[PDB]
RNA sequence: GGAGAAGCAAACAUUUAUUGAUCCCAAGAUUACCGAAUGGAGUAAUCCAGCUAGCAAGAUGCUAGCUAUCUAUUAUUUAAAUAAUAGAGGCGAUACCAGGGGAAGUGAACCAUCUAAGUACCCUGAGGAAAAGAAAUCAAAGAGAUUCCCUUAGUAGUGGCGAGCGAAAAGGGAGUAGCCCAAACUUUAAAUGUGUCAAGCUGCAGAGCGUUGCAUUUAUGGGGUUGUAGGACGUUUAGGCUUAGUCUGUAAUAAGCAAAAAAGUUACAAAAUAUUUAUAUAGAAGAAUAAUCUGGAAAGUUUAACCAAAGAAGGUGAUAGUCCUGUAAUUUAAAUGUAAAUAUCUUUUUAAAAUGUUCCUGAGUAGGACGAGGCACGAGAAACCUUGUUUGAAGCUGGGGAGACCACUCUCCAAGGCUAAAUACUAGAAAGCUACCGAUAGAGAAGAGUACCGUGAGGGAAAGGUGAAAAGAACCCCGGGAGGGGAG
RNA sequence: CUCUAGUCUGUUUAAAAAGGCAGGGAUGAGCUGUGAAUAGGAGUGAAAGGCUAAACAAACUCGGAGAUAGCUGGUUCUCCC
RNA sequence: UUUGAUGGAGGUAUCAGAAGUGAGAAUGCAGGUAUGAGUAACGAAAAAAUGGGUGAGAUUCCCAUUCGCCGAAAACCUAAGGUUUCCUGGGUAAAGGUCGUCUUCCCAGGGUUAGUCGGCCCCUAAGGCAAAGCUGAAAAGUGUAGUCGAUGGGAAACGGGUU
RNA sequence: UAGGUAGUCAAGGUGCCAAGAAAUAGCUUCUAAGGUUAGGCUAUAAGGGACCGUACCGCAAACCGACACAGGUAGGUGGGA
């Protein structure tokens, strides 16, 4: 898996924004098959900077209840689960694309 | 559907790399919030798949240069 | 589904409100087998177009007529359509007389 | 199983049939069948040892007394050949 | 195939498509992980490796490719051990077939015989059919493999002779097809035993004393398959020659070569194309209506046509042969799949009509004793077949059968192995039909084995319809809304 | 922390077996968490014909099965003799 | 079978044929709705009250001041389980035994960062599978070498702060 | 400062009989086939952290009782008089 199938997209959220402003942390949606090592390697190849460390989380799928055309519960649907990555850079390092 | 139906193997490889650049940057801009042509994602993805088959055909020898 | 009418033709409306009124084909919904004839089957419609509250308004627009209710009309004649093979071209002609469309 | 390793004989299932009365060929009015039950007739396998000088060693086979009799009549090699088995399948 | 497409329904704003899209068919690529799951292990969708290649490879890094087991065949002392290929594992058909296991509820107004019944079900096997299949048979008629129907026939028999169970032959049909091994002899040897003389050879002579001398087993070819014919011996023969019928040279025979016939549906095996407007899997063309009246809407009312190998069935604003799609009769095949036919290819005979002496013609087999089952037939006079425990033959100068048995007579020739078709079955695929259903009906399910219930096995619902078209009620009034009253 | 004599509420209850008062055990034949083993003519039972997924003088599910009943119930429009 | 209202799209004479051919009950089945009845309850005898704010609407929401209750808990921190019920914002068809501006209700968005924790891992208890061997109609049953199997045994961290 | 609960010292000590897990792990050590920087130990400097769970409820309207039910519900904290 090339370093392009690893990183999916960043996250722009209030929590991630404050974290990035304060302690220089970048949060990405990554592929569920990645791990710490190739996430770090992918960050290096993509943005030409080596991260100090990486943390990964598995976000479970959010369940929804599906109702009929009239509308009344007939089953349980679910969103897609995904993997979230916190990436820690050196205090001088930056990522510009954001 | 773009036209690569005359490209050589390594030219196709270079095309694949810069199209992967384009797809990654497009995803990033979409998340940042405003991209005028969301379907560009689908178009680029299909292009990359085309390149993957065509290259594969080169190694498999089905399509000869 | 399959049909022998082309967008842009001029057709005469067989049945409906608009007897024999002749108009151009603007669009064809072949999922429902319906056709939109310009300035025919002309209905009043209301649109808000969005929930924010500047204004909404009444506009006039054509409604899709069924395919079966129109018939090609060229040079003062309306008739069925057959097709012929000449010059390696699937061309169309009028069953009543047999001319180039 | 209780299976002759040469021929393939296996146990045979049948009935258990009691009879009351006296057979007509003994002057009796006849016989009457009672309550039949299920039963099995068992092959009498023997775990025999045949010493084979041809490789100077003894091979142990599960054979029935019938197969032993036939081996005594015809010879072990020929009997194995007739039932399309080979001595090396044993050991 | 031609103008839209972005699934199954549109919506909201983004592109693509005449550079031939979408879609349909054929083929190929990609094809995560689990699962027969097979590197080990495991709480199925996941941790742990061995080895090799590339990632600065590296500190439990990533990716690619191998190492599971059984059976058959040999590379070896096929057991042990690895190696080599070949065939299998599981699912599917809540169908069919074969083999093994085999009830119980009932009837007999009880029940124990019997019946139900080889039924349900379990288990082992494969196939598209399976099984069976070319008479040691039916059976007293002159027939002639096996299987499936109509009759025989509810007959013949059987049955605590109670209830019940229940043929076969012949005849008339569907459908057709007969064959190949072992053994008798011989060649090529090998292995294992035994053997130092007159042991091989068609017969005179010379050579010859071991062409391995004689046997068994393994492997190869010839030889042959039955109311007792095939081989060794009896001749015409033997197309014709080359080689040799222990070696050379002759009467005298085999091994090869002209000449022919068949063959992957049994009968030897492995294919490959051309070739068949043959077929399966995408398609193309396709006939013949105007007016008038009612009505929102005509296809209908009425007045006149036209087509028809097409008045089958749907949709079209109310009821269409001629409005649209289709329908009759025709017809698209690059590629793929399935079929025959033709040669190619493969294999075989490269000979038959012909008399008597010897050899073989299927061995723990036929049969008998005891204990069981299948035959319609429950020990009954109980044949016959299979079969467990025992015993045990003949060798055509023979044996089996002809419902106990004996004699005669008439038939047949087992103890080796195959065989298409007629026949069973439809989960399904396509094309069609119905005095079949129209939402409490019809599959449980027009929305699905979902919701729900139970730890699990498992059980299991209810809910179809606006209008011809959303053309979904702008705007205004009451009300927080909902909703209603107006306006459209 | 584990058990239920006696009494009462409750009994179309809050609970398809509790609660309100009380009592026995309370360093032991003790209580209990977390895994595992024994399955139907069988298991288990300091033994009452108890229990084995709220029902056990032979569990439950599926199939035979629409089992058999001399027993009970039901059996739909009309007229004439 | 005639006239009307309603209804807006198929029925049907005569003759003949064929049945899933006629319901008032089976403690019948399915569905709707009466009856008891605006009656019993509205779920423990720990207890609420005032003022203010939000809101169209407040005895039941929020805030504040009093009172009351538990306090070897009715408190706090971790399992067994549940699986978004957690936080922010918006809303009240139903559902909450009433009301509701509120909720574990609904909609949208957001939220779980490990070398030191718990697993994974290297080990074994009971137990399970298990080549070979042995025993059985099949299916399997026994069982050795092995391999799995924690509530057990094994390397490493504490304090404070921040949303 | 004084007093001192509950651990802990302690798998201690002292007595008793019912005589009270295993380990192929870990730690330590030993030698074969093979090795003699091939390794290992004693240090320093540099960096290598696997994969998953991680919210919240958890004596309760969020678990198990058809319920927002007077029930069951493991373990560690257990203030003051």
Curated annotation (Swiss-Prot), chain A:
One of its GO terms (molecular function) is rRNA binding. SUPFAM superfamilies: Ribosomal proteins S24e, L23 and L15e. InterPro entries: Nucleotide-bd_a/b_plait_sf, Ribosomal_uL23-like, Ribosomal_uL23/eL15/eS24_sf. Keywords: Ribonucleoprotein, Ribosomal protein, RNA-binding, rRNA-binding. GO terms for biological process: translation. The keyword Glycosyltransferase does not apply. GO terms for cellular component: ribonucleoprotein complex; ribosome. Pfam families: Ribosomal_L23 (PF00276). HAMAP family: Ribosomal_uL23_B. Belongs to the universal ribosomal protein uL23 family. Part of the 50S ribosomal subunit. Contacts protein L29, and trigger factor when it is bound to the ribosome. One of the early assembly proteins it binds 23S rRNA. One of the proteins that surrounds the polypeptide exit tunnel on the outside of the ribosome. Forms the main docking site for trigger factor binding to the ribosome. This is Large ribosomal subunit protein uL23.
UniProtKB/Swiss-Prot annotation, chain B:
GO terms for cellular component: ribonucleoprotein complex; ribosome. InterPro entries: Ribosomal_uL29, Ribosomal_uL29_sf. GO terms for molecular function: structural constituent of ribosome. Gene3D superfamilies: 1.10.287.310. The keyword Acyltransferase does not apply. GO terms for biological process: translation. It comes from the Bacteria. Belongs to the universal ribosomal protein uL29 family. HAMAP family: Ribosomal_uL29. This is Large ribosomal subunit protein uL29. It comes from Borreliella burgdorferi (strain ATCC 35210 / DSM 4680 / CIP 102532 / B31). The lineage of its organism: Bacteria, Pseudomonadati, Spirochaetota, Spirochaetia, Spirochaetales.
UniProtKB/Swiss-Prot annotation, chain C:
GO terms for molecular function: rRNA binding; structural constituent of ribosome. GO terms for cellular component: ribonucleoprotein complex; ribosome. Signal peptide: none annotated. Pfam families: KOW, ribosomal_L24. CDD domains: KOW_RPL26. InterPro entries: KOW, Rib_uL2_dom2, Ribosomal_uL24, Ribosomal_uL24_CS, Ribosomal_uL24_KOW, Translation_prot_SH3-like_sf. Transmembrane segments: none annotated. One of its GO terms (biological process) is translation. Part of the 50S ribosomal subunit. One of two assembly initiator proteins, it binds directly to the 5'-end of the 23S rRNA, where it nucleates assembly of the 50S subunit. This is Large ribosomal subunit protein uL24.
Swiss-Prot record, chain D:
Transmembrane segments: none annotated. SUPFAM superfamilies: L28p-like. Pfam families: Ribosomal_L28. The keyword Acetylation does not apply. GO terms for biological process: translation. GO terms for molecular function: structural constituent of ribosome. GO terms for cellular component: ribonucleoprotein complex; ribosome. InterPro entries: Ribosomal_bL28, Ribosomal_bL28/bL31-like_sf, Ribosomal_bL28_bact-type, Ribosomal_bL28_sf. Keywords: Ribonucleoprotein, Ribosomal protein. Belongs to the bacterial ribosomal protein bL28 family. This is Large ribosomal subunit protein bL28.
